[PDB]
Amino acid sequence: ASMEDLQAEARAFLSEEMIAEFKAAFDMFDADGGGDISYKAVGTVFRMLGINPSKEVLDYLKEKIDVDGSGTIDFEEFLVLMVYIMKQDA
Ligand SMILES: [Ca+2]
Numbered sequence: 700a701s702m703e704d705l706q707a708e709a710r711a712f713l714s715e716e717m718i719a720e721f722k723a724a725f726d727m728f729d730a731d732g733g734g735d736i737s738y739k740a741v742g743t744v745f746r747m748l749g750i751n752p753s754k755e756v757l758d759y760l761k762e763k764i765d766v767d768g769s770g771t772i773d774f775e776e777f778l779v780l781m782v783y784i785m786k787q788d789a
Contacts, residue, residue, distance in 0.1 A: 701760070750781060
């Protein structure tokens with residue numbers, strides 16, 4: 700449900716301007732070459748936006764993101780994990 704339900708609210712928190720830099724860092728790790736990167740790549744991207752790759756997220760991405768079994772994260776799967784931590788990021 701990480702992508703499906705969560706992307707809906709994600710766009711409410713993250714602005715399109717924010718998405719601009721999100722996709723900038725995301726695009727460099729494009730695995731399928733279209734809108735799709737591996738969730739592990741986040742390690743570098745998370746550093747660019749200043750997000751903390753915590754224990755919860757690593758455990759969360761498998762069951763909530765890749766319940767879909769893509770082995771990767773589409774931009775829709777990606778936006779969620781960023782805003783997920785960022786929303787509570789103090
Ligand atoms: Ca997936």
